[PDB]
């Protein structure tokens, strides 16, 4: 069925649950063998969200090259990302190794450090131009170069040094601030603002390694970022954008990365950004 009409005849039914144990019941089951070795409980923010041995990110590192992020490789809409979990106390340093090894430019953040009462991920980024910060397990220094505050997001310039070859690289961290501590915003509005934004920095584009995206576990948020940004792509790619099946680009993404989405509200919210992105785009 198309989408929008799919859409008004799930909400009259009622049947979002039913739709989305669909998904939960067809999703791909891969082993996750690296990610429970007992050396790497302390790299883990949940234990019942790892990332899949075919599709983990390998850190560049003889000792242990275990971090939870996953790529996800969308073939026909010529898009790669990388989706990891928020940072802990102990993996700082291993996060900004990946963003240095997989050549990203930008990172995107859907949560905030603190949500209901309690650390949802660490304060890995410098809030202050003179306050740098090292990184002495894998040798990287981090400064803040500008922020930019706006009322839904926030947008950082940051300088990234490998200390051991001196070379630096300029990364941009896109910040949505206003995700609320429960349910999905009652707009996509501010979203799709904010996916444009991303977007028209470069940081989604082939002349870049694949971009990083987290929220606390990086599997909710995150997967409603991407399944979006990929949906509204292939509907500019295809001549019949009415062919566009969001459960099956949702399916192919978990072949990638488990748990895509992470209630049924959440579905339904993805739904309401491809429809109104998909009107915006146009031409119109
Ligand atoms: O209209 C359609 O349904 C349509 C148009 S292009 C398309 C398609 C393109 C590429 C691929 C892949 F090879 F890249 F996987 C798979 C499907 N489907």
């Given at each position: 069925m198309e989408m929008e009409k799919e859409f008004e005849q799930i909400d009259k039914s009622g049947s979002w649950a039913a739709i989305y144990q669909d998904i939960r019941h067809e999703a791909s089951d891969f082993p996750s063998r690296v990610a429970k070795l007992p050396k790497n409980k302390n790299r883990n923010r949940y234990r019942d969200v790892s990332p899949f041995d075919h599709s983990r990110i390998k850190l560049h590192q003889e000792d242990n090259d275990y971090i939870n992020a996953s790529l996800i490789k969308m073939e026909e809409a010529q898009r790669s990302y990388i989706l990891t979990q928020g940072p802990l106390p102990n993996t700082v340093g291993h996060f900004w190794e990946m963003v240095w090894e997989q050549k990203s430019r930008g990172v995107v953040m859907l949560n905030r450090v603190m949500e209901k009462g309690s650390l949802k991920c660490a304060q890995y980024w410098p809030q202050k131009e003179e306050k740098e910060m090292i990184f002495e397990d894998t040798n990287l220094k981090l400064t803040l170069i500008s922020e930019d505050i706006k009322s839904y997001y926030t947008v950082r310039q940051l300088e990234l040094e490998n200390l051991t070859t001196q070379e630096t690289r300029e990364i941009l961290h896109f910040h949505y601030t206003t995700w609320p501590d429960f349910g999905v915003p009652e707009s996509p509005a501010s979203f799709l603002n904010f996916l444009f934004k991303v977007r028209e920095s470069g940081s989604?584009?082939?002349?870049?390694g694949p971009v990083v995206v987290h929220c606390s576990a990086g599997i909710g948020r995150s997967g409603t970022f991407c399944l979006a940004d990929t949906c509204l792509l292939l509907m500019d790619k295809r001549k019949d954008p009415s062919s566009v099946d969001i459960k099956k680009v949702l399916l192919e993404m978990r072949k990638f990365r488990m748990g895509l989405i992470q209630t049924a509200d959440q579905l339904r919210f993805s739904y309401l950004a491809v429809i109104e992105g998909a009107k915006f785009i146009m031409g119109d």
């Open positions: 989604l584009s082939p002349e870049h």
